[PDB]
Design a protein around this ligand. Structure first.
Ligand SMILES: CSc1ccc(-c2nc3ccccc3c(=O)[nH]2)cc1
Ligand SMILES: [Zn+2]
Length: 208
């Protein structure tokens, strides 16, 4: 049921998605071990992910959350990196896409910083890097990330350095408490609370 529509680089929607990607790169405490060394990306393609059934699955859940939270879904646009990006865009998020060992429990994790999600494209800790060169910092191989619509509802705030949501909450927010430049990371425990809106194909760029 999924079709992928290419956005033109001239389209305002391409441009605003690229800007969110590029502007939320930061340096990471691993010095680039997991995701590579780079300050920016070469965006090769941005596609909109269209699946009626998956969209309706998302909106149904969004309304349930909204009605439990004074008509406020608390919807965000967040990045997701994963070895399973191809299954997600065809079958939706579910328990098989969860970070079982994540610091907020087994759930599906999203980031404000695109460079955080980039660390998971080739697996946890960057796995063994690109399939072809076994390089976590490969500047040649094409990578993919998702830019997703995520319903947070009432989010449990964790001030820090599939399971269930904390009672009375719909998600967890990991607030950065040491690295003053890091943006927030979020966890949902129901695959229905996210829709994979954009598929972004890119390379990390070697700093000059
Ligand atoms: C099913 S195996 C797996 C494990 C971890 C992640 C992941 N973890 C994150 C943790 C924090 C922020 C973003 C992410 C993120 O974008 N992805 C994706 C898939
Ligand atoms: Zn490579």
């Amino acid at each position: 049921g999924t079709i992928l529509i290419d956005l033109s680089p001239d389209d305002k929607e391409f441009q605003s998605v690229e800007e969110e990607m590029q502007s939320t790169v930061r340096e990471h405490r691993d010095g680039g071990h997991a995701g590579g060394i780079f300050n920016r990306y070469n965006i090769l393609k941005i596609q909109k992910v269209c699946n009626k059934k998956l969209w309706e699955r998302y909106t149904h859940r969004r309304k349930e959350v909204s009605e439990e939270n004074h008509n406020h879904a608390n919807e965000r646009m967040l990045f997701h990196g994963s070895p399973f990006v191809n299954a997600i865009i065809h079958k939706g998020f579910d328990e098989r896409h969860a970070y079982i060992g994540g610091m907020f429990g087994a759930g599906i994790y999203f980031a404000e910083n695109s460079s955080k999600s980039n660390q998971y494209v080739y697996g946890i800790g960057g796995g063994t890097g690109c399939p072809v060169h076994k390089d976590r910092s490969c500047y040649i191989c094409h990578r993919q990330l998702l830019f997703c619509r995520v319903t947070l509802g009432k989010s449990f705030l964790q001030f820090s350095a599939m399971a269930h949501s904390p009672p009375g909450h719909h998600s967890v927010t990991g607030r950065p408490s040491v690295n003053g430049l890091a943006l927030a990371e979020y966890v949902i425990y129901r695959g229905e609370q996210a829709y994979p809106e954009y598929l972004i194909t890119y390379q990390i760029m070697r700093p000059e």
